[PDB]
């Protein structure tokens, strides 16, 4: 990325917006993260995750031990 | 961490605008620091791409069986 | 027979050449009796020496006959049957080494003794 | 280490709006720039096109003019050889190797590998005598080749009798200096890995062999411009007359892979066989024990410094041994064993090559039997045991190893000397008032099969245990 045009400006200077596309790059991937869930710390929000899944598997859990082995008939 | 991989790009970028500056202005170790740091902001943007993608599917998994499983119990 | 086992000591405990006789003289009363002396030492070494022969010993041996018995030196390196050997390598060595006796002298017996050293001449 | 403060101060200094303008401003109105634009391009993704850009790069940076002929692969042609997309001759063979490691992205491998087969053909011919060395040293190959096709025609056995005798190079295709030719040194330490088989693609990086090469020196040889080696003789290697030769400052010399302790009869030997001067200068002719401790210290190559001083010690099969070289002695003759190190050789005839070749490889195996016992191996402390066996060096390529029998109560000595190439002569000097410690065909077998001083003596210990 950046040595191709380092090398084009080399080659041109012998004798572009490399720094915009970068910024715009930049953006366009903290706003996909963001979209996505990288807003914070990583390790933070792995284990956020852990403990969702944990809390909805036990939630499902909970719900099939309520469920399935029923009480009255 | 957005916060982060955007701090290391821009200071990454930065150190390559000053060196190309400074190659272009006269006719090292900077040129490494910079190549270094662009490296490595490479590598964490991955990273954080993947990490960003599997937090996304996990959450929209997550919030689907949550709301699923909450709705019935309610 | 001990005395064999401390010279392989020496030998594989390599010495100063000088605490030699220091650790040679510690084994024994250093008087009480020399009929046990040097009458197999070189022999020894020299035979397990074989087809070589055997630095670092001999001048052990040189820097001890210096002040010590020669009688016994003649009676072995005469009767040092070598001849079946004939190695012509240790043989050259033992005449180097020998060569100091008449060199410098053939010391006395002190008795009865000295005459048998004229035997072993 | 002050890398952060650095940081600190172009992150101040740059402030974006100033940067992009600056650079904006300072594009509309030497040879750094491109090493590190192309150091930072070795490390980055490149396409078929950047990928030959980079190469041709690297390749102006390293001085070669190659410009680029095609997309996929370029024709890499550079005053000395012209390799094919795929000067004085052009690509000989497609090899795969160097194509795949330039194409990877460990180039420098590849260019380093390029830039040594192509300084081989800069010799100080001036366009001109450059051109006949590089004539005479193909010819030079090609009767290697016909010689060593030979050997093999008369006994097309495994690599193992290769290595044992024969050509005196690797067993690689012809490309420049390594072309096809068998094992000259016999290395124990290759014969297995924690393990040798007659492969195509089979052990060319083991052995301690080297391929020929032409050296410049000073007197200028009679170099065969032609071959000269055409008609060999059925078990012998034969050749003819020339014409013819030219006087050129450069001979067909066999640098082995290291500078292995050779003794002065081993220098008389060589200089007799090859006529050329075997020391191209005065050489310092130092002890051949010091040569040879010298030898067994640089032949572990690693920052672990031991310093043994003579006395080196290790663990046995079932026990733990030790030896003592004790340089620095008279030799038979009545003088020290003063000896030097051989690395290099001229050959100027390659009809007679074989045989000097033969006996350094023959010596140096003696040297490697000997030396067998010698490692860094730091076996202090160790009271009961420790059977340090005398290994000194009794005459010509003899080694003499006095141990303390156990089984007996004397020493007893065990002289090995190198008979043949493959076959060194053992004998165990014992005490007529001692025990039979082991026989001559159980020391023969530990030594033409095994041949390790430490591994010698524990074979002895163990059949002294046994009988």
């Given at each position: 990325f950046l040595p191709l045009v380092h090398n084009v400006i080399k080659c041109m200077d012998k004798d572009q917006d490399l720094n915009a596309l970068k910024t715009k790059f930049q953006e366009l991937r903290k706003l996909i993260g963001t979209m996505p869930g990288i807003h914070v710390s990583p390790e933070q929000q792995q284990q956020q995750l852990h403990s969702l899944r944990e809390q909805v598997r036990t939630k499902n859990e909970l719900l099939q031990k309520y469920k399935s082995l029923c009480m009255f008939e | 961490t957005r916060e982060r991989l955007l701090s290391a790009l821009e200071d990454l970028e930065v150190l390559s605008r000053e060196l190309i500056e400074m190659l272009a202005i006269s006719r090292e170790n900077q040129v490494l620091e910079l190549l270094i740091h662009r490296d490595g902001d490479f590598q964490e943007l991955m990273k954080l791409a993947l990490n960003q993608g599997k937090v996304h599917h996990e959450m929209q998994a997550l919030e689907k069986e949550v709301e699923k499983r909450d709705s019935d119990i309610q | 027979v001990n005395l064999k086992q401390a010279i392989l000591q020496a030998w594989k405990e390599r010495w100063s050449d000088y605490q030699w006789a220091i650790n040679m003289k510690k084994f024994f009363p250093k008087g009480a009796t020399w009929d046990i002396l040097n009458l197999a030492e070189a022999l020894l070494e020299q035979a397990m020496i074989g087809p070589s022969p055997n630095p670092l010993i001999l001048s052990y041996l040189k820097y001890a006959i210096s002040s010590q018995m020669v009688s016994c030196s003649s009676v072995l390196t005469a009767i040092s049957k070598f001849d079946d050997f004939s190695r012509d390598l240790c043989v050259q060595a033992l005449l180097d080494i020998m060569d100091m006796f008449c060199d410098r002298l053939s010391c006395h017996g002190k008795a009865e003794e000295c005459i048998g050293l004229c035997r072993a001449l | 280490l002050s890398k952060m403060s650095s940081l600190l101060e172009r992150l101040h200094a740059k402030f974006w709006s100033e940067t992009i303008k600056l650079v904006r401003q300072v594009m509309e109105k030497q040879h750094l720039v491109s090493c590190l634009e192309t150091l930072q391009k070795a490390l980055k993704v490149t396409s078929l096109p950047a990928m030959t850009d980079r190469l041709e790069s690297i390749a102006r940076q390293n001085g070669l003019g190659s410009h680029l002929s095609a997309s996929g692969t370029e024709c890499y042609i550079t005053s000395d050889m012209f390799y094919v997309e795929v000067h004085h001759g052009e690509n000989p063979v497609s090899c795969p190797e160097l194509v795949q490691q330039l194409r990877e992205k460990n180039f420098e491998e590849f260019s380093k590998h390029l830039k040594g087969l192509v300084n081989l053909y800069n010799?100080?011919?001036?366009?001109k005598l450059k051109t006949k060395m590089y004539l005479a040293l193909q010819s030079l190959e090609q009767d290697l080749s016909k010689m060593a096709i030979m050997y093999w025609k008369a006994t097309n056995a495994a690599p193992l009798d290769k290595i044992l005798h024969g050509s005196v190079g690797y067993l690689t295709p012809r490309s420049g200096g390594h072309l096809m030719n068998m094992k000259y040194y016999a290395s124990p330490s290759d014969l297995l890995d924690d393990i040798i088989l007659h492969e195509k693609n089979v052990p060319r990086s083991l052995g301690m062999n080297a391929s020929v090469t032409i050296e410049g020196t000073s007197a200028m040889y009679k170099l065969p411009i032609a071959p000269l080696i055409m008609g060999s003789h059925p078990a012998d290697n034969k050749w003819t007359p020339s014409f013819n030769s030219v006087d050129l400052p450069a001979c067909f010399f066999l640098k082995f892979p290291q500078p292995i302790p050779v003794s002065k009869a081993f220098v008389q030997k060589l200089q007799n066989c090859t006529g050329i001067p075997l020391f191209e200068t005065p050489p310092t002719y130092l002890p051949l024990y010091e040569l040879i401790t010298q030898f067994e210290l640089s032949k572990?190559?690693?920052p672990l410094p031991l310093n043994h001083n003579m006395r080196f010690y290790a663990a046995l099969p079932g026990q733990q041994h030790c030896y003592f070289l004790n340089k620095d002695a008279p030799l038979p003759d009545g003088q020290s064993l003063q000896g030097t190190l051989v690395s290099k050789i001229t050959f100027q005839h390659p009809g007679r090559v074989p045989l000097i070749l033969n006996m350094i490889r023959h010596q140096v195996a003696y040297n490697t039997l000997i030396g067998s016992c010698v490692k860094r191996t730091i076996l202090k402390e160790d009271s009961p045991g420790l059977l340090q066996f005398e290994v000194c060096p009794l005459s010509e390529s003899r080694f003499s190893v006095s141990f303390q029998h156990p089984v007996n109560d004397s020493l007893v000595c065990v002289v090995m000397d190198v008979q043949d190439s493959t076959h060194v002569s053992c004998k165990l000097y014992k005490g007529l008032s001692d025990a039979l410690i082991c026989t001559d065909d159980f020391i023969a077998k530990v030594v033409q099969r095994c041949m390790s001083i430490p591994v010698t003596m524990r074979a002895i210990r163990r059949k002294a245990e046994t009988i």
């Open positions: - | - | - | 010799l100080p011919g001036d366009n572990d190559p690693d």
